Design a protein around this ligand. Structure first.
Ligand code: KOU
Ligand code: NA
Ligand code: NA
Lengths: 254, 396
């Protein structure tokens, strides 16, 4: 499919940035997670980034560490996450769906088989958090064979060699985390997938700022999860607060 | 691009977030440079000799082999300053930290022995040391926590995940990814992302080099086999390395069998786990069927690393080294036997290596064999654990 290509073309028509929330699948439970995700979409999310709970998320800070713990407390497994992904896609045919994965969960039952299941359930991209471009070949190849975009992080300490590699290897979008203008213009020069800024995006002004700097949009890596954490005792207030937040963040992409 | 091969056959690699790759490349370059630098080697040699106490004895055990055709030597890393082999490679890594202009050390620890070694090296060499330790481990290792603190290190309990060694490993990597301009990550075993398996081997290889010289002096020939416990793989690869090209010499690594392999309550991923990708490397893992990382179980606290170094996985795959397991009860018996018959109190980790040598002897008592066991540490730290077990049984 071409879900990212179609989204960016549509956003470019409307002079609009993308806003992409992250949440952990199955946090704080499967049912509530499904409702959370439909609320994010209804409220204006342009795409989703979805985590699968993993025992040892060594690229994640405390907010997401705790989300994983909640999902494990609810007994959430990768198999259940894939059942969730199929249901999400069946409800929402055009929204790009990206996974944030740890390498062991991709490798566990075979790299090719993992990407084949992603294709079957309708996932569009996979970012493997602990696979640097240097180790990425079998992941990117399997992704592309199954019509999945492999997503790479361009970190704050990126050099030119890395920019060229990420530009060559990535698809869908570049996950942006040396001057910001430099990275963004260099990525465009090298024909990289459109850049989404993912560093500490927690307020509307940061969305506007990302677009102004020339990025195609912004990813909220943990702010959505923080709202879940804060509202655990009140499922209905949780949804209300998520709606208000996503609405505000999307409004800022204009 | 790296200077050195990050893999041992299919095992190893650099499976870290992209943000950490510059830290690994910097460390590899500093190591390669250090290995060609006579000044670095002389400073390392001086600390090993005059601070740590190398060379360590090779003790012939006078009583335990009586009535058999086994001759058994113990390489006495229990006599190194700090009471275990961990001290050797911390001194080398602390010097690499200084070579790179770092002023701070991060370390992970499970049983606390690597944490103590990191703390003592940091105190000697003027580095600010922080140690991550799973909260469950902190609770059960108050003596070591206190030593680390007496030596001026900050000990940070880790409450995420299982609150054990793996979780402490994650936290150390998280810290380093933000702090690597000023801090060095002093990884405690021959595992993790390249270049650590290589560095840790080269900074432990004096164990085997000395053993070779000592056994030649005393016996006029190489050993038939050298035997070492395997938690993450550092003391074993330190003993093995200099013998790898001596193809007649057996290399035997002993993983913890815990309550027995068939119970699943063990720590023997090399022979009984499944290859996965975690902690920066592709290696055999303790893991669930759906790929969640699990803990290693052993009576011994130090055989808790839930994977194994990739060079061991490689040496096994090609048949150069053989790996076996020893249960809690076998290790405990070997502990008691060495105390009573040789007057040496061995670490419970090391007791796993000794137990397998005793099995080699007892199973075939008329087989002529010259064995060396790496005695990776002393067992003072274990006497309460042993006491509690012997009382529970009713032996005391
Ligand atoms: C006296 C002794 N012998 C062997 C080992 C086993 O480690 P390798 O296989 O030699 O690397 C250890 C380990 N201890 C670690 C993990 O808890 C630590 O202290 O942090 C040890 O303390
Ligand atoms: Na004898
Ligand atoms: Na292990």
């Amino acid at each position: 499919m071409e879900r990212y290509e179609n989204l960016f073309a549509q956003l470019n028509d409307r002079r609009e940035g993308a806003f992409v929330p992250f949440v952990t699948l199955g946090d704080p439970g499967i049912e509530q997670s499904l409702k959370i995700i439909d609320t994010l979409i209804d409220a204006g999310a342009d795409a989703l980034e979805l985590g699968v709970p993993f025992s040892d998320p060594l690229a994640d800070g405390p907010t997401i560490q705790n989300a994983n713990l909640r999902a494990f407390a609810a007994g959430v497994t990768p198999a259940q996450c894939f059942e969730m992904l199929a249901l999400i896609r069946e409800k929402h045919p055009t929204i790009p769906i990206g996974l944030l994965m740890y390498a062991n969960l991709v490798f566990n039952n075979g790299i090719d088989a993992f990407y084949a299941r992603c294709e079957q359930v309708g996932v569009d991209s996979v970012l493997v958090a602990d696979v640097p471009v240097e180790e990425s070949a079998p992941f990117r190849q399997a992704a592309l064979r199954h019509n999945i975009a492999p997503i790479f992080i361009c970190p704050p300490n990126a050099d030119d060699d890395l920019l060229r590699q990420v530009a060559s290897y990535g698809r869908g979008y570049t996950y942006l985390l040396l001057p910001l203008h430099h990275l963004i213009e260099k990525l465009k020069e090298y024909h990289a997938a459109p850049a989404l800024q993912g560093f500490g995006i927690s307020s509307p002004e940061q969305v506007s700022a990302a677009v102004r700097a020339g990025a195609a949009g912004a990813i909220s890596g943990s702010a959505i999860v923080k709202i879940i954490e804060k509202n655990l005792a009140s499922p209905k207030q949780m949804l209300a607060e998520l709606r208000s937040f996503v609405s505000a963040m999307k409004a800022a992409s204009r | 691009t790296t200077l050195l091969n990050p893999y041992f056959g299919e095992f190893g690699g650099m499976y870290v977030p992209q943000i950490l790759m510059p830290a690994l490349n910097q460390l590899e370059e500093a190591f390669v440079s250090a290995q060609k630098d006579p000044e670095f080697q002389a400073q390392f040699a001086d600390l090993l000799k005059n601070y740590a106490g190398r060379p360590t004895a090779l003790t012939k055990c006078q009583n335990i082999t009586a009535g058999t055709r086994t001759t058994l030597y113990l390489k006495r890393e229990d006599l190194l300053h700090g009471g275990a082999h961990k001290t050797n490679q911390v001194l080398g890594q602390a010097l690499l930290a200084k070579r790179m202009g770092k002023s701070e050390i991060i370390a992970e620890t499970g049983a606390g022995q690597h944490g103590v070694a990191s703390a003592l090296a940091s105190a000697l060499l003027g580095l600010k040391c922080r140690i991550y330790m799973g909260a469950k481990d902190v609770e059960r290792q108050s003596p070591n926590v206190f030593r680390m603190r007496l030596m001026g290190a900050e000990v940070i309990p880790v409450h995420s995940g299982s609150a054990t060694l793996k979780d402490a490993c994650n936290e150390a990597l998280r810290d380093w990814s933000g702090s690597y301009e000023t801090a060095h990550y002093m990884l405690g075993t021959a595992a993790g992302p390249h270049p650590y398996p290589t560095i840790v081997r080269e900074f432990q290889r004096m164990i085997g080099e000395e053993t070779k010289a000592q056994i030649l002096d005393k016996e006029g020939r190489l050993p038939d086999a050298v035997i070492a416990c395997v938690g993450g793989g550092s003391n074993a690869i330190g003993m093995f390395a200099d013998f790898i090209n001596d193809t007649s010499v057996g290399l035997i690594g002993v993983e913890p069998g815990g309550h027995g392999i068939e119970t699943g309550e063990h720590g023997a991923p090399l022979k009984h786990g499944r290859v996965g990708i975690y902690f920066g490397m592709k290696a055999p893992m303790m893991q669930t069927a759906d790929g969640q990382i699990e803990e290693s179980y052993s009576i011994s606290a130090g055989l808790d690393f839930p994977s194994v170094g990739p060079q061991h996985a490689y040496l096994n795959s090609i048949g150069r080294a053989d790996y076996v397991s020893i249960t809690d009860d076998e290790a405990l018996e070997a502990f008691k036997t060495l105390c009573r018959h040789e007057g040496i109190i061995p670490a419970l980790e090391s007791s796993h290596a000794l137990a397998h040598a005793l099995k080699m002897m007892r199973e075939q008592p008329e087989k002529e064999q010259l064995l060396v066991v790496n005695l990776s540490g002393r067992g003072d730290k274990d006497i309460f654990t042993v006491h509690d077990i012997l009382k529970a049984r009713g032996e005391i």
